[PDB]
């Protein structure tokens, strides 16, 4: 029984959230879960990984993410 998910961390400096996500799951769900845990909508936040602002349809696989990678979240302009 593999083991389909990787670990990701999303942080904004204060709020830090740990995710277990599939390589093939769109990051929309992670971005939505993080924003909405803030009581915000996905589109009020920007998510950064490797000099790139992540878009909702991208997967960890599209971005070559690795187990234990970190996503930076910040206020204003998504998505």
């Amino acid at each position: 029984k593999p083991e389909t998910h990787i670990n990701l961390k999303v942080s904004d400096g204060s709020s830090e959230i740990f995710f277990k996500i599939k390589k093939t799951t769109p990051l929309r769900r992670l971005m939505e879960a993080f924003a909405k845990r803030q009581g915000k909508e996905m589109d009020s936040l920007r998510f950064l990984y490797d000099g790139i602002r992540i878009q909702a349809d991208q997967t960890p696989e599209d971005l070559d993410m690795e187990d234990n990678d970190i996503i930076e979240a910040h206020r204003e302009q998504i998505g």
Binding site: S15, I17, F18, F19, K20, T25, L30, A33, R37
Partner: protein, 93 residues
């Protein structure tokens, strides 16, 4: 304000540790338990217990070692899980 609450070691042998926490929540998918030697980037081991569980046994420990024990509560959202504010304690075996 850390979840689960009331994380503790309830029974301990030099190589073994029984921990419990408050599992009042009905929506928790599972608790993830990680443990390694305090400070040291010694390999952290992990296992999970379902969200209905409130105890777990950590065995295979070496005597006189300080461990950091962390418990994450994970929740489901579509096809992922996420966790915030894990609880940790230290315990010298």
């Amino acid at each position: 304000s850390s979840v689960p609450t009331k994380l503790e070691v309830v029974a301990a042998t030099p190589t073994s540790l029984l921990i419990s926490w408050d599992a009042s929540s009905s929506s928790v998918s599972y608790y993830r338990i990680t443990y390694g030697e305090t400070g040291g980037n010694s390999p952290v081991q992990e296992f999970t217990v379902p969200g209905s569980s409130s105890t777990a046994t950590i065995s295979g420990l070496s005597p006189g070692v300080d461990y950091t024990i962390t418990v994450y509560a994970y929740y489901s959202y579509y096809d992922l899980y996420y966790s915030y504010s894990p609880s940790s304690i230290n315990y010298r075996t």
